Amino acid sequence: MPIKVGINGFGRIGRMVFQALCEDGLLGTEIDVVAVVDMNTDAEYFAYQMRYDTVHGKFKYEVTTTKSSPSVAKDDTLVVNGHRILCVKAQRNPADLPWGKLGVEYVIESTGLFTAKAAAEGHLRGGARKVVISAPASGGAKTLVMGVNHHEYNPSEHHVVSNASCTTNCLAPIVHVLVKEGFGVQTGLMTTIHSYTATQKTVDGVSVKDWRGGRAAAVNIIPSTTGAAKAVGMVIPSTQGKLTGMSFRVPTPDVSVVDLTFTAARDTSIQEIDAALKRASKTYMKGILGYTDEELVSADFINDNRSSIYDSKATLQNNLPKERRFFKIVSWYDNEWGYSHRVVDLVRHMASKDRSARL
Amino acid sequence: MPIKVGINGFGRIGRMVFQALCEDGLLGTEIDVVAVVDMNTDAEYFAYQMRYDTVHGKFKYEVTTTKSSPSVAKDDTLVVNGHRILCVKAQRNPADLPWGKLGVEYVIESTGLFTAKAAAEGHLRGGARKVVISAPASGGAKTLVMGVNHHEYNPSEHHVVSNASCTTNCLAPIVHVLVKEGFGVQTGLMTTIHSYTATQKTVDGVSVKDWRGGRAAAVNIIPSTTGAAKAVGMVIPSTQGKLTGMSFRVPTPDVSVVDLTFTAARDTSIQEIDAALKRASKTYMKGILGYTDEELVSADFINDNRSSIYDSKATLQNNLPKERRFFKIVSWYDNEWGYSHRVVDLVRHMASKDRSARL
Amino acid sequence: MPIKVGINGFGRIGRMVFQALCEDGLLGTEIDVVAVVDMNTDAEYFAYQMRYDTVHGKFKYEVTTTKSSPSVAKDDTLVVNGHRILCVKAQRNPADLPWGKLGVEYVIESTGLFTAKAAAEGHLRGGARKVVISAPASGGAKTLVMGVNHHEYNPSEHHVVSNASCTTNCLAPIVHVLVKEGFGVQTGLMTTIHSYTATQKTVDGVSVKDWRGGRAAAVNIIPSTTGAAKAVGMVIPSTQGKLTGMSFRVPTPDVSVVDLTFTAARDTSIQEIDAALKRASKTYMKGILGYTDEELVSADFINDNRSSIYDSKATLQNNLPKERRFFKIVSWYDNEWGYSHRVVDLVRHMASKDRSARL
């Protein structure tokens, strides 16, 4: 029996989460995507959105539409290689969602609207058992980063969890290696050079909570505060209060880069750090941390499924000769694609643990 | 008397109408902007928005804020050249706006929410005498294009009017000159190569009424239907049914161009046409239709106050040799800025006529 | 027996011809790419250029490098799928190139420096038998557009040919269908909304032969004259003097669109034209002309192998109701990719004809 999954919110992440599932052959074997929800039930429009993607190209699998019953006016069901997905109408309140009627057990919460634990807990009243919030959460939801602290998931305690942010998923693997291998981090500040996102504006618009963020996205460099570096504190508790950073939002539609500057806890060298990151990526961080030693630019990381892709040449070439403590590490991430894979990874991990906890 | 103006909507459209008015030296002298009405009343934010523009640069005057009474916590009044503008909270119904109490006679309706004549007529109940919709209108509002048909304004009959669209304001002066000068138009098709706008999306997103328009704006050429060419029929009734057109939305934040292809009603030449357009711009179309014979690109038309800037070189170089009927005309427009000045021009024209009708 | 091919010029144009050749699975079996010629001999850089593409993604074939003889300083040979490719140095005169010694029969002339029939004829003195200029040519070189007039190729007369331009390859199939299906073309004007190209400038630069062309490419709409519509008169001689046009260069890195406005030679309808275009694309224009009836934007045509992709929705929605003569047709092209495959198609066609004519 496949894991019965519902996706609440069918946008960049919702759809990329679905692409990941499909491409890795999980659909209908490991995971059953029972339903997807967005603004309407117009399956033809959902199919169009899945089929064509400015950044990630044409969806390579056929998407067709059909009716759940003849009593329905328009197609409300997606069909992907025989797999049927009901398109359900959005709700203001998660507890009204028919998860129980649908047999959905795991909900991927990707609207951006229910990041408060109490809000997301709505899904549990609707019949679901577990919720993965595809973003930082508030209200004490356990935060899990695949490859860093995901084994801290506890089936009997953790029902609404957060998969953190794409940025935290790039940074945390790096910091994890530094901490685990005994380099340590005394202090660190991160800058992410970040592609614009759905929240931004095409031309100067209205943004009362984020004045800079209201300015035209694809013509400016736009600074922002970010919780990503501080969030590593919750995932790697020893780093609590030692890390913060900021974002510069720049005119690319996808792919971002972390520029971490930090002080190590012991004498080391960039060469030693470089060697450790490469080893980690070949071993205990495989599939999470990758690396390159080629002359790559942002377009070259499109569709990379790793959380963090360490840039060896950028890092080795741009550090201080002979330096023992104060270093810069550069790492890339396809902010849509790697993160979406991590959501799927996390659901799979949770289901495995839930199964085990039964007996 | 300085005419008493209120602006409903102080998003980008209302903002730029205000900035154009100020640029013309009109604030506190010819026009009393009494109030702006909007979701937010944070004058500080409004002042920030006026002060800095990604496209149009720095505002020529200083903007400060103050309080309407010592009681208010956050500044709720804008000040420019000594002139106070109250920031008023938006109302669900225009009927409920305090235009009567504020002594506002003319309302610039820029929200895009009240483009139906009967909806905009609510301002009249609110206390206003006249409404200019800064967009195409429905429900029978008289449409007026400065330099083309504005003299059709009838003070006793027209209380809710439309200034049409920026595109119609580019195209109509061209068609007007072709008809007035005896070339005639048998049939025409227009293409506008158009900067992206606020209605578009940074990344691929939901756009139920415009699928193409949901796609990432700054990395796509995005076709669209448009009403601009058909609308010319309403200001030049003899072209009714002879014109239509489309748009290609492209990754520039401002400035657009009309590419008009048409059949003349008599044998002529592109040289005759070129000469007529130039003659008209220097005379009866002065301030509305301009022209260039220089090697200009879109950036060169930023902050141009004219409705239409005929590209003599692009036109003369790209027509068929010896052709007598089938022609292309190229004309530019700062889609934000010319239109803003036209909204002001129209209010001023209506005001002069209203007063002439009374005294 | 596979044909022996050399690529004069291995810039972006030459590169993509090669990738297209591999994509069709012709390397080794149908075509032998014996050598490339460039100012550069470095092969490692070539492999890097071949491996990563900002627009077209990652090359699906593994590229390694090696030496032709252990005597040479650095690698001078590319290895794709076990197939070896020599890198030779550029010559002042094409007569000096060693095609005869290399055993190369067919040369793809993609430098742009030997656009004249006489200059490109040097390749024949260098031991080659046929030349394909991957650009418009002068000096009376035969211009061949696949699916339009390629059967006009004559093995004993035509030894140096042109594959025209990417824009001509988009427009010509459209005009060809209009002519062959009996609609005809009395007059037409074409506008291409064109992605920026290598010849353009990142920031306002120097471009003495094209003043507008020197301006910042990714932030301007930039008009240009073009020869593409005129060149259709060479391919479809009945249209000589009936067609011209222009382009607007816009801020996208690849994919362009033709906007053709024309008067038919008989009374017809947009519905009749739409049906003919679709019928043609399924039959005698298969692989050259395609169509969509979906809500597509420029990204959706990336990596499309067709010369011309007719946009049925954009065409049907944006024509004049009940019109019998004056029509607009919209058609897309990946300006790099469709054309690259056509260069390869032409070579294959010339090969098989040369084979038959020798028999």
Place this chain on the structure above:
Amino acid sequence: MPIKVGINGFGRIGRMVFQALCEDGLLGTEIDVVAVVDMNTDAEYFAYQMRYDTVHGKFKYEVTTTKSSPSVAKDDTLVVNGHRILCVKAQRNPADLPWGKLGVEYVIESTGLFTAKAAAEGHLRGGARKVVISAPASGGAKTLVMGVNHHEYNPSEHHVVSNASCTTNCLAPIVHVLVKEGFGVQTGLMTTIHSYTATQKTVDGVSVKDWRGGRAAAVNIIPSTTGAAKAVGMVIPSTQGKLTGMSFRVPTPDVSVVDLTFTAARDTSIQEIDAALKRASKTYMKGILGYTDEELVSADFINDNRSSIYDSKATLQNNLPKERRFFKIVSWYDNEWGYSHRVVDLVRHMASKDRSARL
């Protein structure tokens, strides 16, 4: 009375220096621009380039062109406010270029091809006295940064100087303040998020000396090594070997930002640093170092003539609370505008010291 100056390399940098030479209102009175030189001598083309700027808008002074002698085909003399400027033809070698015959002492070297001191010394043999390289130099030329070490100019020992790079001119004022205020700098790493430049490519192209730098500029984040931070160690000798950095080239046409992370030599706070930068900006650094406490984005710094504009909000919000040593400072620069004003500022400073000590 006026300084006899000749701009060599009337490209981007050459022109903007010239515009700064006029913007300050000193053409004719204090500085006499004798001659400019690019490759062509089309005054008409030069005037067009000067009139229209994609980034900086319309030039505020009217430009005309005339002939110097009736014997030559087209004009070769520019006229700005009555002041006449000749357009001499470039030489491949600076020594062949006739500066003495023209009577030019101060030459602004802005071709970018004569960055070697020995090669740039040719200007002297050609008949000129003083040279200012508008870029970093190699071979032992004296590097001067306005507001930092410009008073180290030695009128008898320094003939071919360097105004550094725009990035160095942003970073140096910051570090200078840190050093002079007693904060100290133990170690520093700098990242510049840099607008693309003329050396970059519209689409993937050939860049043998920088593989990443050949990739399409307006659609990629492109990392690069830089010398700007190391160059500061040369201009502020107490920091030699203690600073380095890198850049990320992003899709904006102008304006850049320095992200400096450093370790102070003793206990301080971000509040003390912030207060110090503000004070310095108002005092000893006035006109070189500016600051903002507003919510600005890159477009807002277009036309700012300061070398470095410290971002107070971005700095104060994105540091670690109660930290005493490890800090991030964010400072902006119009990489075109500020630097051009400094080139003018330097020549003028050199002018006085040359005629007070050596005269």
